[PDB]
Each structure stands twice: as structure tokens, then as C-alpha cells.
Design a protein around this ligand. Structure first.
Ligand SMILES: O=C(O)c1ccc2c(c1)nc(Nc1cccc(Cl)c1)c1ccncc12
Length: 333
């Protein structure tokens, strides 16, 4: 867990520490001799990280919108990163949790989907995509330019992801791949759209309960394959063709001690019902057709990212081709 004060020595530079950033740990340091401020992270989970940072060090961090890693050096192994400004949670919070308009959501989506495409091409799973792991480079001089950070959970093709952004296959204990990151991306853009997480479950039970209430139960063939399914669902009869039912909150609390909570600011009966919420009424004529068409494309993309079966879930390349991202739906105006 190390300690603090001032200064550290690289294999190629020297870094004076100025400020603690959070708990491995991350610290803000001055690249001595330059005008650069950098973020240094001080950590087998480190071996996997450095290797993946290495396999990406050869790729274009700016082109694919993932954080630039400069050098690795032991001192405890340290990792030097470019300094970013603000993660998406602090952005929303600093904005009093008001919705983000779609026109600003679109370029964030496009940059993160691009990074996911780069990761899928290298056979890599990020496994911790979430608003804290997406940072605005400079919200004032480069508005809405973002970098994906934190490959500490990353892996090549258990208990993964941050719970609000966790895919059904991880909740249920199914086989999985890089598709889990696309589910997290859907939860991220929905949250920018709402100003609040879509599925803020306080436990894995509440998480799959929220998802099931808005999207229906996962299909029987998924439930029957999951190693964790019976923690949250009962077979009302034996297979073949069990009648799968979600445990009720009272029943689930009774056998578990976990009390269910209500953490949602919005409860949708289905994802289509999102399309209308928080729209500007003042829009006149052709501007409102634009907005209504933008929202239809956005929920259409959102539903394909939040497809419960990972085999049917849209891929990064295909979202980069979706009209919400490309804006071909707006040419009809
Ligand atoms: O892991 C990385 O790749 C990683 C890479 C870059 C940053 C980071 C983590 N964490 C930051 N802040 C932060 C905020 C809260 C908790 C923690 Cl542990 C760290 C940060 C800030 C400014 N610029 C780059 C970073």
C-alpha cells in the first residue's frame, strides 16, 4: 500500500508527486524537466495487466480511445499514464445528475465502441467498463473526447464487472466472451441518457430482478445453463421444461438475510418506454422530427446492446454501423 511525500525515479525520467488521486493506488506526478503532468498507478493480476498494457502500447491509444500507457517500472510495479480530467460519474454529478442530450452521448458512444472494437480484434475482454472507467481528456478544450482506462480486470478469451454494469451471463454463471463489455456499454449510455443508472442493483439478486422486471425473465435455455441461476430463480417443476420463476423479494430475503432495496429513479415496463422521457417540448416542426428520430434510433441501439442472450447481442463493429452512431437517420431531413 506504500506511502506518500514527494518524488520517485523512473527507468527513463523522474516524477515528483503532487497529489493523491485514489486507492492498487493512483497518484498525480510532474514529469520533471517537462510541462507534463501524468498519472502513476502503483499496484498475478499485475502480470496480466502489464502484459495487456504492453500488447496495447504498440497500438494507437489516441486512434482507439484507450488511455496511453507510457512506461512500466518497479519501485512494487508502477505504471505511468497520461493525465485525464474527469470520469463520467463525476461529470454527471458535477452536472447535478441531469440527463445528457443524445448529441453529446453519440461521440462518447462512438469512442468507447471504437475501443471495444480494437479490444475484440485483439481477443481482449475489458471486464470493468463503467462510468468511472471512462474519462474525459479535457471537457473544456476537447469537449466529450474520452479515453477508456483500467485494464486491471482485462483478460484474454467467475465474478467480473461492476454490478450495475454486469451482464446476465456473469450474473447467471454462463460461458462468456468479450460480449460482456457491450452490455456494460448499453448500461453506460442509458445512464448518460437518464442521468441515473438504469439498473442500480444493491445485490446480484436485485440486479437480475431489475433487469427481469424491465426486459422479462432470461429465456429458459439461459437459466437452465447457469451455475448461479438457482440463487435468484426457482424451478417450479423439474426439467424438462422447468417453470422458472424469480424468487420474490420476501422469499429471497427470508432464506438469505439480504433485504431487497429500491434504488431506481426510473422503473420501465420495457425499454421502449425510455424513448420519450425528458424530451424537450418546445421543439418546433422539423427539429422535433429530428429529436424523435434520434431517440428511436437510440433505443433501437440500446435494446440490441441490452440483449440478454450474448449470441444475439450487437457487436462493436455493428454498433459503429448503427444509424444512431453514423446519423444516416438524420439524412431523411
Ligand atoms: O488503471 C488505469 O489504467 C488508470 C489510468 C489512468 C487514470 C486512472 C487509472 N485513475 C485516475 N483517477 C482515479 C480516481 C479514483 C480512483 C482511482 Cl484508483 C484512480 C486517473 C486520473 C487522471 N488521469 C488518469 C487516471
Amino acid at each position: 500500500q506504500l506511502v506518500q511525500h514527494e518524488v520517485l525515479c523512473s527507468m527513463t525520467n523522474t516524477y515528483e508527486v503532487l497529489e493523491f488521486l485514489g486507492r492498487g493506488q493512483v497518484v498525480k506526478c510532474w514529469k520533471r524537466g517537462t510541462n507534463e503532468i501524468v498519472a502513476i498507478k502503483i499496484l498475478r493480476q499485475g502480470q496480466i495487466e502489464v502484459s495487456i498494457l504492453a500488447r496495447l502500447s504498440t497500438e494507437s491509444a489516441d486512434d482507439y480511445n484507450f488511455v496511453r500507457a507510457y512506461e512500466c517500472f518497479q519501485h512494487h510495479t508502477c505504471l505511468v499514464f497520461e493525465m485525464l480530467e474527469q470520469n463520467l460519474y463525476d461529470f454527471l454529478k458535477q452536472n447535478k445528475f441531469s440527463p445528457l442530450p443524445l448529441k453529446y452521448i453519440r461521440p462518447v458512444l462512438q469512442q468507447v465502441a471504437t475501443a471495444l472494437m480494437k479490444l475484440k480484434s485483439l481477443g481482449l475482454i475489458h471486464a470493468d467498463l463503467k462510468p468511472e472507467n471512462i474519462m474525459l481528456v479535457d471537457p473544456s478544450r476537447q469537449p466529450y473526447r474520452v479515453k477508456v482506462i483500467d485494464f486491471g480486470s482485462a483478460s484474454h478469451v467467475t465474478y467480473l464487472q461492476s454490478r450495475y454494469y454486469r451482464a446476465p451471463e456473469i450474473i447467471l454463471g454462463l460461458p462468456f466472451c468479450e460480449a460482456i463489455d457491450m452490455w456494460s456499454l448499453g448500461c453506460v449510455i442509458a445512464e448518460l441518457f437518464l442521468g441515473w443508472p438504469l439498473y442500480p442493483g444493491a445485490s446480484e439478486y436485485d440486479q437480475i430482478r431489475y433487469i427481469s422486471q424491465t426486459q422479462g425473465l432470461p429465456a429458459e435455455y439461459l437459466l437452465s445453463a447457469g451455475t448461479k441461476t438457482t440463487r435468484f430463480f426457482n424451478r417450479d417443476t423439474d426439467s424438462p421444461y422447468p417453470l422458472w420463476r424469480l424468487k420474490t423479494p420476501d422469499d429471497h430475503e427470508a432464506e438469505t438475510g439480504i433485504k431487497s432495496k429500491e434504488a431506481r429513479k426510473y422503473i420501465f415496463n420495457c425499454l421502449d418506454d425510455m424513448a420519450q422521457v425528458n424530451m424537450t417540448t418546445d421543439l418546433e416542426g422539423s427539429d422535433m422530427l429530428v429529436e424523435k428520430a434520434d431517440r428511436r434510433e437510440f433505443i433501437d441501439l440500446l435494446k440490441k446492446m441490452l440483449t440478454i442472450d450474448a449470441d444475439k447481442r450487437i457487436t462493436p463493429i455493428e454498433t459503429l454501423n448503427h444509424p444512431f452512431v453514423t446519423m444516416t437517420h438524420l439524412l431523411d431531413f
